[PDB]
From a paper:
In mycobacteria and other actinomycetes, glucose-6-phosphate dehydrogenases (FGDs) seem to be the main producer of F420H2, by catalyzing the reaction [name] + glucose-6-phosphate → F420H2 + 6-phosphogluconolactone. Since the identification of the first FGD two decades ago in Daniels’ lab, only two FGDs from actinomycetes, namely M. smegmatis and Mtb, have been characterized in detail. These two FGDs share 37% sequence similarity and belong to an [name]-dependent enzyme subgroup within the luciferase-like hydride transferase family. Rh-[name] is strictly dependent on [name] as coenzyme. Rh-[name] was also found to be highly specific for G6P as electron donor.
We have focused our exploration on Rh-[name], the best expressed one, characterized the kinetic properties and elucidated the structure of the apo protein at high resolution. Only residues 254–263 in subunit A, and 250–279 in subunit B lack clear electron density and were therefore excluded from the final model. All attempts to elucidate the structure of Rh-[name] in its holoenzyme form, i.e., with the [name] cofactor bound, were unsuccessful. Nonetheless, the obtained overall structure is substantially identical to that of the [name]-bound Mtb-[name] and the architecture of the active site is conserved. In Rh-[name], the sequence for this structural element is shorter than that of the homologous enzymes and corresponds to the disordered part (residues 254–263 in monomer A). In Rh-[name], out of the three residues, the position of Lys258 is unknown as it is part of the disordered region.
Author numbering:
A (entry chain B): 1 to 249, 280 to 334
B (entry chain A): 1 to 253, 264 to 334
Amino acid sequence: MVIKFGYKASAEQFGPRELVELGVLAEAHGMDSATVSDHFQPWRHEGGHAPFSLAWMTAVGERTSRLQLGTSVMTPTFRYNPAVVAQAFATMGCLYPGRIMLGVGTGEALNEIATGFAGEWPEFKERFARLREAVALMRELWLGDRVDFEGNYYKTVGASIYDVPEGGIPVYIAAGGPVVARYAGRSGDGFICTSGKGMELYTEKLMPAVAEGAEKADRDVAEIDKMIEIKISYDTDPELALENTRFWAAKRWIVASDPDEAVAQIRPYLDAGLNHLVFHAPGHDQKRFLELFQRDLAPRLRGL
Amino acid sequence: MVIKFGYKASAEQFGPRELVELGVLAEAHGMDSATVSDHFQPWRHEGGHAPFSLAWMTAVGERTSRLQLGTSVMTPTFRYNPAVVAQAFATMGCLYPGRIMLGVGTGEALNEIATGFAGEWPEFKERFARLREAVALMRELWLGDRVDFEGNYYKTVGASIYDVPEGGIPVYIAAGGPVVARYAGRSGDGFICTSGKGMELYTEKLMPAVAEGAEKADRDVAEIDKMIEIKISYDTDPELALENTRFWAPLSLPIEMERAADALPIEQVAKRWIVASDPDEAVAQIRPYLDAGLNHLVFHAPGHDQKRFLELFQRDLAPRLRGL
């Protein structure tokens, strides 16, 4: 897939209007994508906010014309009905053709417990199985009609979605290990991972797992968009570059005031075959980040 | 509450982009509000749609500046988690200050069975108990800090919503009878009913019930917005005024059902619609709802050419209504 640079909006750090305006500024400053995590719980310590992700996506969508928008990620398996998730994303894709994706993961307990999940949090195998089932259900609604989906967890009866782009909505699967990454290679339209683990995670585990799955499924691996969230504090002021990380309380972060050093720290992800770099910055001044990214980092990255 | 005229956008009848553009046109043509029904299933097979209500509300909100937006109605009790509903509406309320409401009903089986609801469909008492519980949970979230809610149906654990307007989000309750109307008087920021059902429903059952609930809760009934969906087929062409009801024929009585609807005589289809081609006659048929004390009239027009309805409404009907 082609090289793309995007922006991760931090839902824990900003209220709804500011978050939306940052997504719009992301397009203004040349980003190819903007994504948001689907949190419910606002954590006082992570900044005290949690704007609803689908409202953010839609508001930014209606204000923009090029930018790809999605979740990174949302858990479609516990506090949501997967059928309704499919409806929401199908509608958004109609509203913003060719610019919507659905990024999904296997789930975090604390948000689900907060919203009323009953009993013991399922183990990884059940969480993963639920995710594959929900993905299939949603795609069946997108592609078919009068769907009677009867899974081990989820169900529909005569369900239809007419208001959907042809072929449905790209689904991006997040993975932090090879088991789910192989699933991404078999079944995802995209793959999402996070930076700042040793580089061997990407080059020995996750990218080979995606390629394996794509082989097993008889697909061309190049058609899978390979997204990485890169945590980066960049500022030309050396003190502000460092001080911006104090909101976030191998190295997990790139912390840099020199744009060539920053680019050097990003390059290894591109060399590992991640093509869709999504930048997540800690400072309160996100407008400055977007301006500095466009001015200093993007031209150097395209120059590689 | 002050008189307002708004627009019912038909999710049943238009796909997502067209529905959004109609919402925006409602504001351009002077409407005070626009609402949408929240269904999952396309309303009918032939020409049916179901765009996701919350995406419509947000996209119209981002395109507008004055219009009040809301659901009329959504069921927050079966395929939605009420805490997530509360989050969604609180976010929208922050995005569009003073312009968002949550309109809720007790629900209908077809949409829930479609989306996986298991077992016997609850009777009215249980659907209504679930609704009241969901509303209470949402309000606790909006107005509280770290909420531990545990009801018969719904639960939260240490849950918070901090991105919410002061005072929360207005909740409007759909009422077809006195029991729910009294609850709207006690607890609703508004109530919603639909026209065409015989004037005694509004004057003898629903309005007095809202007033009684308000008095029992020590509220001023004037603070409750009294909304009615006015089913009106206005067109200066009398053939269109009648024939534009056709899409809605399923209301006037499975693939057989729809064949049966398409074959209904148009007079039968049009029975509970105001059909008018003269603007004074139209207004005469609207006026009894104002006289009954409904203050927020949301006009629902049946035909495919909704831009023409909005232009006609602004030209012919709004000035006459303001003149009452």
